Every structure is written in structure tokens, then in C-alpha cells.
Amino acid sequence: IPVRGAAIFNENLSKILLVQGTESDSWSFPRGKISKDENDIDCCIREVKEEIGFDLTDYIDDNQFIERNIQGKNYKIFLISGVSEVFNFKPQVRNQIDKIEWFDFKKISKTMNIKYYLINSMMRPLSMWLRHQRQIKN
Q: Taking every annotated instance into account, which residue ranges of this chain make up the domain Nudix hydrolase?
């Protein structure tokens, strides 16, 4: 039942990488259900690797995340930066997701043309985290 995933930002903290699943047209964080034989990090790493072909092992920080209980499910979304915009993202299995695209992060706030899921309700802490990262890395 618990879900783990990642908010994956590019190097200059201006874009976020979102995916659209096979079951709907909304864009959200790459993520998946936790298996009984794994912890929060291993779930995130495994699911993101399957969805976008990128290994977060050396990017993930187990103390940087947003956890929200939404609609009967527990979400824990790890906060990631420094991921290359030119990496050739591709799912390990073709049906793990439908699409993978970068989004301009500041522009997402426009919504509520494009449907989002989870990210809009996390917009406040996500934005605060990002702006703080932007101070650190100057």
C-alpha cells in the first residue's frame, strides 16, 4: 500500500522530470508500491529505475523527502537534484509507464491543458525546498 517515488530536478533546479502512466493521462512523480522485502530507499530506487532507466542510488538523500497521506495511501517522495537533462530516459519494461518528460517547474503552478497528480498538493513544500536548494548552490 505505501508508495515511494522521487521529485527529480535538473542541475540548475529549474525543471522536474515527470511521467505519465499507462492507466491515465495525468503527469506525476515516478513512483511505485513498496514491496514487503524492501525499505523506502530501495523501493524508490527500484521503481524509478524501472520507470525511467535511471539509477538514483548516488543521488537520493534519505532525509530529504515529502511524506503526505492522501486518499488512503501513504506517499513518501524523495527530493533529488543534479540529474542531467540530456540523459536518455527510457523504461526498463515498455509498459511500466507511457511517457517521460521534463517540465518547467515554476510554470506548473499555472495548474489547475495538462493534468497533474500528487504534485499540485505538494507544491508548497516542494517549492520551498527548491528555492532553498537554489540558495545553497549559488
A: 1-123
